[PDB]
Amino acid sequence: SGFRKMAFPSGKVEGCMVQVTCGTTTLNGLWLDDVVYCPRHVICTSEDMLNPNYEDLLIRKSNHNFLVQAGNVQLRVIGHSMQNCVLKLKVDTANPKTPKYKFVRIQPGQTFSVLACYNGSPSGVYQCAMRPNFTIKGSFLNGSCGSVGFNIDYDCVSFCYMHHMELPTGVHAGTDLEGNFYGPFVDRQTAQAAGTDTTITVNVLAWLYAAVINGDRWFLNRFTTTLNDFNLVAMKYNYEPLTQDHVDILGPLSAQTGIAVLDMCASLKELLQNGMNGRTILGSALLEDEFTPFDVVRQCSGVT
Amino acid sequence: SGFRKMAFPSGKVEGCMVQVTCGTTTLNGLWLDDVVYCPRHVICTSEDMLNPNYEDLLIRKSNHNFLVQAGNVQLRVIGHSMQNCVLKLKVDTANPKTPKYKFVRIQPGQTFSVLACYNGSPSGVYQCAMRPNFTIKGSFLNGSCGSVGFNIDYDCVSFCYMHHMELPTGVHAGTDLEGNFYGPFVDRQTAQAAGTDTTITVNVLAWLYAAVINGDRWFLNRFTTTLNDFNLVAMKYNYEPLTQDHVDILGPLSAQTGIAVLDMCASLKELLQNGMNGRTILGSALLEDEFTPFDVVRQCSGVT
Ligand SMILES: O=C1N[C@]2(CCOc3ccc(Cl)cc32)C(=O)N1c1cncc2ccccc12
Ligand SMILES: O=C1N[C@]2(CCOc3ccc(Cl)cc32)C(=O)N1c1cncc2ccccc12
């Protein structure tokens, strides 16, 4: 019992964190096999960030200008290439701690763990979600770039995010491990607005199921609704539209609690329309949307 | 920018997690040097838990009845002893992954990271605090016993908690690594009520400082207060009394923001008396008390 914003164990990802320095810029890199992945803005000065031409900036860089340090030892860079917004630095040594891994591009609403790093050293681990506007509400200071987001499936690490940027609004932007930004963000110090941060409806529902499983049942009501009626209310409250796919994905939680998905939707509808009235659900005074249905099943069943 | 409930990287603690089986009971153990630490209730059956006499139950156990498994390999138990509510199993092999470590007994209000484990395998990591009633609001299923709480200071892991019990109220109870329970809890399946769960005032204040640092300033007011006046209001709201030690501990956050501690106290006082009015602070609709002043300084400065 108890429900916590839980992150995946970070050991497997800690074994991959290295420091990459180019000129005066130092950020983090991810060392998997004989390649070190890092944000391409490592080649930029703070003046370059206003309007960088990464191809031209990269021409003035050779293998020896990229200083890669793993722990306290220097890695020899035998090649370098730019793939979208990331640099791939080929080193002569394969990482002996390379876990089984995949590079995945997640969809908005999906959650992942972030290992915040500085100078190739891990400082903390937290859980977050890819917002529907393709930003992440992270915790990153200067020097955190190159910190990664990942999920673990038993022994396979699926790397889904690499930190690149903080927007003027305090939200974060980054890429998948192929260098493609999530959302319309570009690695430039220019005016970039995030877009409407809507609530991940299916995750809120999953978290309502988690509360029922853990004993918080005050919000359960005598009502039901339809997908269309619920969506009318969801639109008004800037909630993502709920589809039949979402209902299907909530099926195992619905089965475990004996509460039909549309009944939980009517409970959520009354919570949006009437508020919490000073009450809490799983020790929270707002509706939490950063647990997917898979996270709730995982946490409530103890998958290791 | 951004403020997240961040846990310490868990790699160093993952390298210590083993599975301990005695009879039909399987729980987690912590392997440091040639000793495996685990809850003594590993020797109990579910019937034994009602009224166990651990000394008598232990007499019927020999070294070979404790099955210790690290990863996929079995450790040879060459000795066993009971120290308060923990068993120490001496094994013939020192853990090659033993980090630098200490065993510490924390005070209520102090925070730590938990690596929730099942069958000696880590499943997740989260941050929590030792509540003023000596319980922890964790996330633990059956089989999680022996999961540990720790803090990391650069390379030294200070182990402060070992999970033992879940109370009928869904809160958790456990010991330090010397086997002494936090609070008045005993390792028995008997009626045990936690006590008043008060709010950790100094942590709430620290988190208000974190919000100011990260831009959430709406709650800052034109008022001030005194320690005695603030404490009158704090008592009414079941908040821990604020002492001069707490004011001193908040000094570096006070210095960074230019907001005197007593001014932040008057802001908190108005928040307790008038509520949030549908507003949020650091994306939260309630006052968060599970970040110490040290955690805020650490997160906001990037200590690795
Ligand atoms: O290190 C960098 N360089 C920046 C500086 C601004 O101009 C740009 C523009 C584009 C890109 Cl890709 C990065 C950058 C950036 O946001 N970050 C930071 C990342 N995350 C958090 C930060 C917290 C404080 C300070 C800087 C942080
Ligand atoms: O594994 C055990 N044995 C228990 C069973 C109850 O009687 C006692 C009495 C004292 C002690 Cl020390 C432990 C135990 C206990 O609480 N836990 C559990 C720990 N944490 C979470 C649990 C979630 C579900 C189920 C059991 C959980």
UniProtKB/Swiss-Prot annotation, chains A, B:
It is found in: Host cytoplasm; Host Golgi apparatus; Host nucleus. Inhibited by pyridone-containing alpha-ketoamides compounds 13a and 13b. In turn, alpha-ketoamide 13b (tert-butyl (1-((S)-1-(((S)-4-(benzylamino)-3,4-dioxo-1-((S)-2-oxopyrrolidin-3-yl)butan-2-yl)amino)-3-cyclopropyl-1-oxopropan-2-yl)-2-oxo-1,2-dihydropyridin-3-yl)carbamate) inhibits SARS-CoV-2 replication in human lung cells. Inhibited ex vivo by michael acceptor inhibitor N3. Inhibited ex vivo by compound 11a and 11b. Residues 1-304 are cytoplasmic. Changing residue 189 to A: Does not affect ability to cleave and inactivate human TRMT1. It comes from the Viruses. There is a cross-link at residues 5, 90 (Glycyl lysine isopeptide (Lys-Gly) (interchain with G-Cter in ubiquitin)). The active site is at 41 (for 3cl-pro activity), 145 (nucleophile). Residues 1-304 form the Peptidase C30 domain. It catalyses: TSAVLQ-|-SGFRK-NH2 and SGVTFQ-|-GKFKK the two peptides corresponding to the two self-cleavage sites of the SARS 3C-like proteinase are the two most reactive peptide substrates. The enzyme exhibits a strong preference for substrates containing Gln at P1 position and Leu at P2 position. 3CL-PRO exists as monomer and homodimer. Only the homodimer shows catalytic activity. Interacts with host FBXO22; this interaction promotes the proteasomal degradation of nsp5. Cleaves the C-terminus of replicase polyprotein at 11 sites. Recognizes substrates containing the core sequence [ILMVF]-Q-|-[SGACN]. Cleaves and inactivates human TRMT1, preventing tRNA guanine(26)-dimethylation of tRNAs. May cleave human NLRP1 in lung epithelial cells, thereby activating the NLRP1 inflammasome pathway. May cleave human GSDMD, triggering alternative GSDME-mediated epithelial cell death upon activation of the NLRP1 inflammasome, which may enhance the release interleukins 1B, 6, 16 and 18. Also able to bind an ADP-ribose-1''-phosphate (ADRP). This is 3C-like proteinase nsp5. It comes from Severe acute respiratory syndrome coronavirus 2. The lineage of its organism: Viruses, Riboviria, Orthornavirae, Pisuviricota, Pisoniviricetes.
